[PDB]
Ligand binder design. Structure first.
Ligand SMILES: CNc1cc(CN(CC2CCNCC2)S(=O)(=O)c2ccc(S(=O)(=O)N(Cc3ccc(Cl)cc3)C3CCCC3)cc2)ccc1C(=O)O
Length: 149
């Protein structure tokens, strides 16, 4: 179908160039990288600081390029611990200009009544599953395993 082909076209033209995470309260950099974690079909790894688990909120800046136009570019993310989905996040970018490069700032908060497990338990056992959409159209599904260091 036209939609399966369009999805592959967007994937082909897409690149994550860089990304960082900051403590939202203080603005301090917690993590930054230039690995394209959007690449599907391989398990990526990232090492984040234990500290992050103590942040009430984390600000993420994500930089990407797209050759293809997108009407409603958005992400769905799932936080799995040992195969169990603990939390589900939804972020919207909206409209993407063909052959543009864009910086996308999002704010991450865990539910207020949730208490974080220690880093030592979590480390190596957290997978972040990210789905890239243009509206209803699934472009890419990627996985990153997290180590808390
Ligand atoms: C809700 N439960 C938890 C959630 C988390 C997820 N954390 C969010 C924090 C928890 C503390 N309060 C503030 C929010 S996290 O610190 O481990 C975290 C931060 C950021 C991300 S991320 O989605 O922004 N991102 C993964 C990512 C981002 C973009 C794309 Cl395209 C692909 C993958 C980063 C890339 C390098 C490391 C993580 C994922 C998990 C951790 C532990 C628990 C727990 O119950 O023990």
């Amino acid at each position: 179908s036209a939609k399966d082909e369009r999805a592959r076209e967007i994937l082909r033209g897409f690149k994550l160039n860089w990304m960082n995470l900051r403590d939202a309260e203080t603005g301090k950099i917690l993590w930054q990288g230039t690995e394209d974690l959007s690449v599907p079909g391989v398990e990526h790894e990232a090492r984040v600081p234990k500290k992050i688990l103590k942040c009430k909120a984390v600000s993420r800046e994500l930089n990407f390029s797209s050759t293809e136009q997108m009407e409603k570019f958005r992400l769905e993310q799932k936080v799995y611990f040992k195969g169990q989905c603990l939390e589900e996040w939804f972020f919207e970018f909206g409209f993407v200009i063909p052959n543009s490069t864009n910086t996308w700032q999002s704010l991450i908060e865990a539910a207020p009544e949730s208490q974080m497990m220690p880093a030592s338990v979590l480390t190596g056992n957290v997978i972040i599953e990210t789905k890239f959409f243009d509206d209803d159209l699934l472009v890419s599904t990627s996985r990153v395993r997290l180590f808390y260091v």
